[PDB]
Amino acid sequence: KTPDDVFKLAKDEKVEYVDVRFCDLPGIMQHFTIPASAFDKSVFDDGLAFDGSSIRGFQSIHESDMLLLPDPETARIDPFRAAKTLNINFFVHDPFTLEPYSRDPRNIARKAENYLISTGIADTAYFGAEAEFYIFDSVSFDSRANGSFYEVDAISGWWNTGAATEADGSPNRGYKVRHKGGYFPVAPNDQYVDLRDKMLTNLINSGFILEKGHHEVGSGGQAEINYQFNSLLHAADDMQLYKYIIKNTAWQNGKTVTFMPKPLFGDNGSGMHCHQSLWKDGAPLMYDETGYAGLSDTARHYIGGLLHHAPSLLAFTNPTVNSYKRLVPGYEAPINLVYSQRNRSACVRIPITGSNPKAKRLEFRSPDSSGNPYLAFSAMLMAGLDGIKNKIEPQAPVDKDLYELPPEEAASIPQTPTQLSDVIDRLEADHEYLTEGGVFTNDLIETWISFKRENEIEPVNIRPHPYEFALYYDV
Amino acid sequence: KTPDDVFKLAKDEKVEYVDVRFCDLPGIMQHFTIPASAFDKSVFDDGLAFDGSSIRGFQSIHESDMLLLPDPETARIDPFRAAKTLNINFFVHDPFTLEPYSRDPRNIARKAENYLISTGIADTAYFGAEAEFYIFDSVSFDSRANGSFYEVDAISGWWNTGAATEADGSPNRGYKVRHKGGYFPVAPNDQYVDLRDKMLTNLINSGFILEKGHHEVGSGGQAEINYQFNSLLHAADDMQLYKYIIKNTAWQNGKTVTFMPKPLFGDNGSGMHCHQSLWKDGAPLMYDETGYAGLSDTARHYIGGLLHHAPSLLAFTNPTVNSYKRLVPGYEAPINLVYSQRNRSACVRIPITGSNPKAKRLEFRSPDSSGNPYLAFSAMLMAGLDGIKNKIEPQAPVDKDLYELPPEEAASIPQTPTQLSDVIDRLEADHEYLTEGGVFTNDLIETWISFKRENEIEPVNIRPHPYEFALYYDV
Amino acid sequence: KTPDDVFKLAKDEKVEYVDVRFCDLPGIMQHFTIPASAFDKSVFDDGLAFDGSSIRGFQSIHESDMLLLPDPETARIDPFRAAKTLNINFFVHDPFTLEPYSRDPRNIARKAENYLISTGIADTAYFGAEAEFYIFDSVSFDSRANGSFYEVDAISGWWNTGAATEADGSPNRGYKVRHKGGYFPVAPNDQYVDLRDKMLTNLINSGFILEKGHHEVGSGGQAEINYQFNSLLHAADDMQLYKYIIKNTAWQNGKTVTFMPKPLFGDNGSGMHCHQSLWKDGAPLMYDETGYAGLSDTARHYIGGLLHHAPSLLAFTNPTVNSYKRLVPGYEAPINLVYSQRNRSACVRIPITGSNPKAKRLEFRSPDSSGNPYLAFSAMLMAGLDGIKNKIEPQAPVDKDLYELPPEEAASIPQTPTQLSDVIDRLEADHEYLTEGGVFTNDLIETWISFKRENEIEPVNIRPHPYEFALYYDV
Amino acid sequence: LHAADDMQLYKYIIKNTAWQNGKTVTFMPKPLFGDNGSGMHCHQSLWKDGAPLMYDETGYAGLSDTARHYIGGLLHHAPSLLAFTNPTVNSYKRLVPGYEAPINLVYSQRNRSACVRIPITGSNPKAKRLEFRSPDSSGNPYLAFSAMLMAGLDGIKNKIEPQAPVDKDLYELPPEEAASIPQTPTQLSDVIDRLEADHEYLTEGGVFTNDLIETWISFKRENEIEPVNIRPHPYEFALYYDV
């Protein structure tokens, strides 16, 4: 789409307001609103200003002003606002030089796409993502000198089977979801069919191409909705809008959604599986009839890159402390760095898609939805490209239940990282693959390490955990 | 606009009531209502009476009667009243001589504009204002012999993360705003989108030219809406009308708004930044390609005047005891008398606007919304004009995060005043720049000093602060 | 008294524990307990260690170890502890050189007495103090992001005349104390006769020579108990023990005492009037039958010193933010700097004592109990001695109600400081009178200033006051 | 041994005196966030033939070579020794700056921010000692005291020189200065990993045996480290619910 397309949409829809959006470093979309009357060619030619110092990972206070220029391909009508609103994503630019900003996540994605072309390896990188989430009824939490707590709740949570009444006083009618039992019985066991239909419809009406929706494994309202894959930048923009549409459809219907990796102890985490494939000149590159799981050398070496670089790569794909509570055995998330066809205990699964070369792809199952998809997709691509360039051979696939390996076989397989501080430490020590062609710059990597250490790792580390009192009060 | 235009508007809108408004000295608009049937030429010819002894800063009881003459430019339909009402601002006049009143804030702004033109320096002073505010749910407070309290509350306040239910008993659904984290994530973190759209719509339907609206930095529903700049008197009239529309939009939708400078301890205050520029014969005066931050000699001298006179000027721009709780480090409000491009820790920031001479301006960040915009804007202009007349050179810009200076280096730059009594004392001792051209008169200045001492400074000073019990109960 | 006298007291009283006490810089006594078996000659010869970095105004963490040596004159049996305990005060010493510590308040008092002797002016400075206090039932307070409160309560408090029941559910029986009506009606209006008797008895049994006890002016249980004057250091040790006996007699009897200067708004504060006189070779120096109020030149000049140095001296005599809430008119506390016989509105009153030269003395009415009496009494003495030495003539006595002076007359009389930051600034600017003879050192004065700014002034200044909500919520 | 028997009985007496009087006592290293943790500082000295060994008037802080080398052993072996002296997950919540507990491996006279403080005891040779400030009460005093002894004795035997004392507030050092000093361990799993890799000083003379060391490592991993690691922390909801 072009600027005039967007002006025509706004006029055609009788839009009242335009919501100007961009991505902060950690991965939350930021916005402000302008009236339809202020949305003119000047928005495209000169841009709009904001306080870069109030956005995480961006500017210091004395260098605060930043600029925004619109991306007309991202213009969509907002399904929630009573006053008719057009949402458009923007790129962040330096207000003096007008150059793209080194810490604009959307810029990283753009650079990644252009670096791919420049290598000659492929022209298009397709990302099909599965961002699971929980549909809860309530959450509360706090952290004080003498105590701390959290509690999430959901009508369908198995912890409520014994409740005398529901939250609102109405009767307990049963049909709650057993732990690991939500994938995927029919209603009334599935208590969220109507709400997910609203989610699906809102996505459809926002121009998503829908594939499917279902309850997921977790008790207390785990869900998954799939939309069609796209090329990297478009997929990442799609992910951000999807999260917005999911969260607000829930909110408007009395619920509260979370995309955090592991809100429930002892039930499935929420992943962001990323199906990936490279194409060049309109043809697939991932397929070879004679390869293990029908994979070409290009595909196998991409995988080699992901599994080789995982120790630093997870800093962008699994970027929170809570991420590492999901990387534990028994919940269809990864615990080690192996690939395998058909295998949901693996780090990379090769889904069964038959002999169609155009369907052949890898599913990187490690990532979760707790950070920034622009950065995560870009980092995954760079890992895979370094694998191809250096012909990195992944270790032999292991077609077994990886949670039930004998202790000795498990010992020779590199494990997933234990905690965020290890991946940040590793990113700091080796990130040359990310800086290739300037896709990630040193200031971005240094800002990310610093942000994670100061705002996440240390704040969790210094606070006593509730289970420490269960273990140690009586020492 | 003319009287006949106003009568036609009232006729065309089928107005039932006319609301007669004027400003008290501290800065609250005052009103009474007349029926449409009493709104005739006589209102314009002879005016309307009120009790000047019931208005703060006005008359003594034995000289009570005062007169009001309408300003037809200010006629606007009221958005809130069920009975269709037309609002009009009035100037206050002596009921014997019919001369403008020396303590009518609207008269001061009139006088300021005429004085500007008389100096030959410029013919127009443009003021663009950013009046931030909090959208709360409730407030309570008292002061007794043996105790005193206040509490503000907001569903989005971070202090409520641990709440078991919301005030109405419905579940806690999270997405509350972190302290200093409100600028500006998408919904549902931003819980006020629909309400701010209603504010924007009401402003647009009252004739404002809107620029933008967003959540601000503060937890608990801080917000900002910007409308287009105008010349001084119009801008001050807009400001008063804006406060009224914001407040009542909030009220009609179950909320309560404050424009107080510092309602929350440890989170952002609410400022009233005033972007200012001088024009003459339809051409800008602020721009010089060769100057630091693109500023002309005229612009620099105006800044020199603001920062030179700040010690007394703040008596009008930062006119409350609570004003000085905002002027503390770490919250994008000023703590010293520095100007600097791009710098949200400075007293005067030069926004980055490029090489367009018509956009070049200064942002005076010290002011807040706690007083009287007619007086604030007028005092700012008088300081600026004194700076120009005396060629007052500002001290060199300091392009640093001003909150992070070590103490010995912080001390080398002039600090903002600590408390209201200091700025009132200073105004008392030095105010000649304000009395130039008779813009502010001695009786205005003395009334202001006396009012603030007797009704604000002393009442706060004699009341034990709750934190004194924290410090001293056990002495 | 000697070490052997203390060992015999401990033996005779069958003491089980000894409580080692010393004074921190702000004025709170500190303690730890040793078993009687560890109270031996070594305590007198080698001293005892503590963590100087955990005591306010003392050491940094890398120079933390300090020493304590006993003062056998201060040994008394503790009235409250079930296990028979002997309390003894200690002097603080450098653990390397064993020299007295320059920030030990008990050392400052010591140094003040010896300085006095070294001048030849006198050999003894007597201090008779009247430390008023409130006997409350309860107190709570807090300070949060969105709110702050305090409340004190007392059965006799006038704010309770309308209570349907007492705190414990029993009936409201009336006879509550009117504001400013507590001095001093008979029971049952006085609801604390039996408790003040217990206070009197505990004091007597701890070796005080009692003079009187009574209800004071304030509602909600204001009280005063007076014991016989003593020379400076003894007087200061007595004050500290008195505060301890008062607070713990109340506590053991279900009440809670504060010595804060102004716990109630609109009722009397709590002062610490300090009657003072200089003697030499067993003869008085303050008397002259021909002077105004029978005052000698020595006495007049001492008064001169007090009133001249007041603007910095109150940094030690009136050392808290709350102090300045008491220094307001209408409550028998001072509001300006004069002396006057018989006059309870004055800063220095000469009590009516007749022709007895041995009774002649001044009452400095300004001081309160919110700080450190070692420092307070020492600073007063150094001011008076500077006055004697430089023959500072006080301005003429004003024998009138100083709250009710006409405006002209009042403005010709220097006022008391308005606030703590003003007296701290003044102390920083002029403290030579205090450093005379090394009695106060620069490190003490610097630590005091720094402590008050960082730990009291700034913390109150940054917190919104509840009355700011009353004034400004609706701005 | 008497000291470790004393410690166990003391804890029993404190806990039960509290309990019989309506209260409840904990010896856990960090029950309050943003206030002081609870340490178990261990003052230590070696004597032979009824004579003290720690004193030398001419040494820094009046310390002999034998004392200095004992300190060398403590600071050198600290990365593994803390498995016995700081043996719980909660231990590492205490080892954070601002609360008079150690954050790096230095000795210093008079210094409550250091790992080893030398208390000021004047010139009496029988009072001269070191205070090892890192340990807490969350484990086993028999094993902690024994492990500290074995560390110090290894220091004496190999004459391990400690790095020079730093007589400064160790929480406030400039970054370049701070980065040049070895830090205390961050978490239990780091000290357990380190103990597993190097425990020879402890097995000397068969004081600690391999079966005790291996049982300790396995106990901590299975019953403490892994159970806390797999449970979401409340503050993760504060940080991440809205991601």
Ligand SMILES: CCCCNc1c(-c2ccc(OCC(=O)O)cc2)nc2ccc(Br)cn12
């Ligand atoms: C034009 C690009 C097709 C990409 N292939 C592809 C497909 C796909 C599936 C079936 C297809 O069959 C149609 C055909 O070619 O006959 C073609 C493509 N599905 C995914 C999912 C994730 C990802 Br990543 C790639 N995917």
Ligand SMILES: CCCCNc1c(-c2ccc(OCC(=O)O)cc2)nc2ccc(Br)cn12
């Ligand atoms: C006609 C008066 C234009 C004043 N300039 C001006 C503008 C402005 C911004 C852009 C402009 O570009 C249009 C043009 O001249 O090409 C012109 C003017 N924005 C502000 C905001 C606050 C204040 Br104060 C002044 N502002």
Ligand SMILES: CCCCNc1c(-c2ccc(OCC(=O)O)cc2)nc2ccc(Br)cn12
């Ligand atoms: C031996 C010293 C007597 C000091 N005089 C003195 C007295 C006093 C009062 C009455 C006296 O009469 C006894 C006599 O000498 O006949 C003697 C002394 N009362 C106070 C109160 C506060 C202060 Br300060 C001094 N006071």
Ligand SMILES: CCCCNc1c(-c2ccc(OCC(=O)O)cc2)nc2ccc(Br)cn12
């Ligand atoms: C007989 C053994 C004396 C040990 N010295 C010693 C002492 C001590 C303190 C003072 C002493 O003085 C008595 C003397 O010898 O004159 C003697 C010994 N205090 C401690 C505390 C912890 C530790 Br570990 C050792 N301590």
Ligand SMILES: C[S@](=O)(CC[C@H](N)C(=O)O)=NP(=O)(O)O
């Ligand atoms: C059923 S599952 O294997 C569950 C994945 C799990 N929630 C995870 O943490 O990755 N997902 P899918 O079948 O959609 O790939």
Ligand SMILES: C[S@](=O)(CC[C@H](N)C(=O)O)=NP(=O)(O)O
């Ligand atoms: C984000 S901020 O810098 C916040 C200003 C702050 N509330 C104050 O002036 O106190 N304002 P803006 O970017 O609108 O000028």
Ligand SMILES: C[S@](=O)(CC[C@H](N)C(=O)O)=NP(=O)(O)O
């Ligand atoms: C009755 S009063 O004058 C009251 C003094 C007041 N409470 C003060 O604040 O100084 N005291 P006194 O008669 O005991 O000297």
Ligand SMILES: C[S@](=O)(CC[C@H](N)C(=O)O)=NP(=O)(O)O
């Ligand atoms: C006052 S302190 O330094 C406090 C020690 C702190 N609780 C710690 O965690 O080691 N203890 P001590 O002076 O008893 O050695």
Ligand SMILES: [Cl-]
């Ligand atoms: Cl971590």
Ligand SMILES: [Cl-]
């Ligand atoms: Cl003030």
Ligand SMILES: [Cl-]
């Ligand atoms: Cl103050």
Ligand SMILES: [Cl-]
């Ligand atoms: Cl651990």
Ligand SMILES: [Mg+2]
């Ligand atoms: Mg799926």
Ligand SMILES: [Mg+2]
């Ligand atoms: Mg799934």
Ligand SMILES: [Mg+2]
């Ligand atoms: Mg495209």
Ligand SMILES: [Mg+2]
């Ligand atoms: Mg999948």
